Amino acid sequence: ALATLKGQQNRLQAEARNLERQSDEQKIFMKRLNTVHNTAMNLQAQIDSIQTATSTAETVKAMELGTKVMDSVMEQRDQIEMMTEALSDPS
Amino acid sequence: DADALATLKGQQNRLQAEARNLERQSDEQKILASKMARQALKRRAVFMKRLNTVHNTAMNLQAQIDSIQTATSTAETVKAMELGTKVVGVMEQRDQIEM
Amino acid sequence: DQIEMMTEALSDPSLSEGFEDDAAIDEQLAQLEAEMD
Amino acid sequence: ALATLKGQQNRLQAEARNLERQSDEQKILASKMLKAGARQALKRRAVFMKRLNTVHNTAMNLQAQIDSIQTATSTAETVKAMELGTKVVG
Amino acid sequence: VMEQRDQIEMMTEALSDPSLSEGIDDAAIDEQL
Amino acid sequence: ALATLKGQQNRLQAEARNLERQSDEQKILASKMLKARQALKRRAVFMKRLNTVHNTAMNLQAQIDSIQTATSTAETVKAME
Amino acid sequence: ALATLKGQQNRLQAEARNLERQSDEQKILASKKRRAVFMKRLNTVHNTAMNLQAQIDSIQTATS
């Protein structure tokens, strides 16, 4: 489906080039060319968005699989610090 | 998890390539507007906002992966650190004698 | 849907950049100008 | 644990080095622009400066933590020796 | 998932105490100057 | 334990040497720039650290001296009394 | 034990001599308060040495 979507966008480009050639001939269709280009651009945006979402989903799923004493030390250090400071104290 | 990291880095490089594109087309839109103009202005403004968005994604993801690494390292080390500290867990007489 | 809910849930700002002082940047502008001045 | 502390220190130092280097380039950038460009360069280098300041503080904290481990061993030895002093003087 | 982030944040705030460090004279600065 | 304490004492001495070295660097910076308050604050912080480590080393040395003296004096003033 | 105490007092006189050197260093630096403080420290070390010598004499008496 993705490959055929790319091919159909290429077909939209072909129709657009044919339509601009026809418009040049008529000057010597613009609405049709505009809508063909809009179709191509919308499908391009769709494929870009889906690719971005798929890559984001894959990487975030991998990272989500990846992600899937204080009291004693503080008290002893504080009291010992106080006592040793009192020791050093020559006041 | 290493695969997650590599995939995130690859997607980030994809974002960077997209930003390089965006700035390129911004260049061509500026040139096209000068050669012409309002439509080129529209498209270059869209390009500029897209560039800002991709830059924001880049910076946010870099900060996020940095947080990942810092938190992982700190959490891993602290467990053993606190296990170690858990395993770890005359004054008057001198004064009198000198005098 | 579920994809969007994953995005919103895993934003985790506390994990990632979760204040500014215009006065500091202004005084640093002035300092740079004085240096050049 | 010690090895991962050393590795985190090396990572933190490399991140710092990148930060102040970047800040130097952005300082040159702000100087060369010097008003809106000056604002932008100052904002960017200020983000880098804040990053560098938290990095400096974090390095201080981790070094203090390692020193705290060593001093914890030291005070364990000291309290052992001063228990020995307790018993002998008693 | 979320609980991991919350607990790492709690541990960081608990261990980020300046009490590990100094944690606490301009006149003396001026005198030495 | 005695060897551990001796190694810790040597480590503290090296720490003090580095602290006085960086304090000297900061103070010479301050002198050059006065030829200032910010560098004075920095060197003062480093000076607080240096004198702190000096106190630690002095206390540890006096501590090992005190334990050896405690053994010896226990013996002696026991003999006297 | 007598030898151990003699070595300890020798260490005390070593401390006292280094303190004397440091006091002279302070004198010469001044010539070119801290000296008084370090002289007090020297007095502490000297007093420790003197007490150690006195108890050494007491040991010599008692053991003999």
Numbering used by the authors:
A (entry chain A): 17 to 44, 68 to 107, 124 to 146
B (entry chain F): 14 to 49, 58 to 110, 128 to 137
C (entry chain K): 133 to 150, 154 to 172
D (entry chain G): 17 to 50, 55 to 110
E (entry chain D): 128 to 151, 156 to 164
F (entry chain H): 17 to 51, 58 to 103
G (entry chain I): 17 to 48, 63 to 94
Question: Which lines from the publication concern this structure?
Answer:
To aid these processes, cells from across the tree of life use a conserved family of polymer-forming endosomal sorting complex required for transport III (ESCRT-III) proteins that deform, cut, and repair membranes (1–3). We show that Asgard ESCRT-IIIB assembles into parallel arrays on planar membranes to initiate membrane deformation, from where it recruits ESCRT-IIIA to generate composite polymers.
This interface includes an exposed region of continuous positive charge as well as hydrophobic residues, consistent with the binding of filaments to negatively charged membranes. By superimposing our high-resolution structure onto the membrane-bound map, we noticed that hydrophobic residues of helix α1 were positioned to insert into the lipid core of the membrane. An analysis of adjacent membrane-bound protofilaments revealed that interactions between them are mediated by their planar faces through the positive charges of helix α1 and negative charges of α4. This was accompanied by a change in the angle between helices α3 and α4 (off-membrane: 145°; on-membrane: 116°). The conformational differences between the membrane-bound and unbound polymers may be influenced by the distinct interactions therein, underscoring the adaptability of the ESCRT-IIIB protofilament. We show how protofilaments are able to adapt to different membrane curvatures, likely through the intrinsic flexibility of ESCRT-IIIB at the hinge between helices α3 and α4.
